[PDB]
Ligand binder design. Structure first.
Ligand SMILES: c1ccc2c(N3CCNCC3)ccnc2c1
Lengths: 156, 39
């Protein structure tokens, strides 16, 4: 299968036609996505198979072929880019200044950008092109608009 | 049966479209990974 670093769509043929259920990041031979996209199932890449290696429902993250490799963090001050990969549409960079999710266990960056559910797992990047988290786990605020956490895993 | 397809490189785009606001929200995270608003 294709192991080149970059952003990938996660597809299924179980439903009508070929449906995009999410997106993920290939980095250092490991595939990174949100748990709710795959539910921890195995994936195919051409004729090859990617087996889950680590996952956590509460973090809503999963890695395949190896441990979670992404460790960059939002600096709390600068604009970032969502590299949105919407279903049936070309990858497109959207620049934004994150907001904050304040929780009892600390603050997390959040991006107020609304894309189809199938865009979950799209990477959020800093100005050096490093992945600071994945888009797709968030909340629906008063006005009905979507705000995603910038979800990042731990590099063991 | 799920499969992956490459969609692009991961790089910052100079002069990308700039949008979105920056809301500061109090939130709670449950054991199932669901975020909710705290009021
Ligand atoms: C990524 C993940 C989820 C959503 C979403 N939710 C679908 C159902 N739960 C509330 C809102 C609406 C719009 N864009 C999204 C992007």
């Amino acid at each position: 299968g294709e192991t080149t670093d970059g952003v990938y769509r996660v597809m299924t043929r179980r439903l009508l036609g070929s449906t995009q259920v999410g997106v993920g990041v290939m980095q250092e031979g490991v595939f990174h996505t949100m748990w709710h996209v795959t539910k921890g199932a195995a994936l195919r890449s051409g004729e090859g198979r990617l087996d889950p290696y680590w996952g956590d429902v509460k973090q809503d993250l999963v890695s395949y072929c190896g441990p979670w490799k992404l460790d960059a963090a939002w600096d709390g001050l600068s604009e970032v880019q969502l590299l949105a990969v919407p279903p049936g549409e070309r990858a497109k960079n959207i620049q934004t200044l994150p907001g904050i999710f304040k929780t009892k266990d600390g603050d997390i960056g959040a991006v107020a950008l609304d894309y189809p559910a199938g865009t979950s797992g799209s990477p959020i990047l800093d100005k050096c092109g490093r992945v600071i988290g994945l888009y797709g786990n968030g909340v629906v605020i008063k006005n009905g608009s979507y705000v995603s956490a910038i979800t990042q895993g731990k590099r063991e | 049966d799920m499969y992956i397809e490459r969609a692009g490189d991961i790089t910052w785009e100079k002069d990308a479209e700039v949008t979105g606001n920056s809301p500061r929200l109090d939130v709670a995270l449950d054991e199932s990974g669901d975020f909710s608003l705290v009021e």
